[model samples]
Target: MSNQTCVENEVCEACGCAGEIGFIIREGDDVAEVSLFGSDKAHLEGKLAEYISLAKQVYANVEYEVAPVADNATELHARFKFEVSAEKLIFELKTRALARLEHHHHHH
Candidate 1:
C-alpha cells in the first residue's frame, strides 16, 4: 500500500502525456518484490489494489486499451471507460463457475 515515484517515460514520449505515471511496489526484506503500473489514482487505488490483494495473498499486471463498441448506425456516438479489483472479477467468475457446478454435484 505504498506509492512509488516515477523516473521518465521513454516509451511514450511521442504517444502522449498519459504515459507511465507511477508504480506500486512491495519490498519487505522477507518477500520478493512486485509492482504494477497505474494510469491514475482511480486506476491505482481501485483496480490495482484488488489485484494486489488477490495476488500478494491469490494473481498479474500490464497496461491496456479499450475500443468503443457500436451503437445503432444512426445513433449518436459515445465513449468508454474502465476498475474493480481482480478479486471482484475473480469472485464473480468463481461464483458463476461454482453455481454451475452446484447443478452437477453437492458439497456439504
Candidate 2:
C-alpha cells in the first residue's frame, strides 16, 4: 500500500486533538476519495454524493455511507456503512488496480 500525505490540520469538536478526528473512505487509487472533519455522527451526506458518483463507475449498484462504529466514543472509528457488500467493491477495485500496474512498470 502507498502512503498518502495531507498537510492540512483537520480536527473534530467531539474529539479535539485526537488522532482519529477525520473520516476517510477511499481504498487505493481507483476508488472514490471522501474525507471529512467533524464529530463522529456529523452529517456528510451533502458532500458524499460526489463520492457515490465516482464509486458508481466501479460498481453501478453501489450504496454506502461513512458511519462511526457503535463502541468508540473517544476516537472516531468509521466503517463504510454499506447497504450492499463492501467486499464486492474492494475485490473489484483490486482486480482493476492490478491491471493498471502494467503501465507503471513500463514507466519505470
> In model 2, which regions exceed 4 Å deviation?
1-34, 38-43, 68-108
RMSD of each: 16.8, 12.7
Q: Estimate each model's TM-score.
A: 0.23, 0.27
Summarize candidate 1's per-residue lDDT along 34-96 as a digit string, tens digits: 233344444433543454344433324432222222332222111111133544455445433
Steric collisions counted per model = 2, 0
Give the number of the best model, judged by lDDT. 2
Q: Mark the 10 consecutive residues where model 2 has the least summed lDDT.
A: 69-78
Error of 1 at 8 (Å): 11
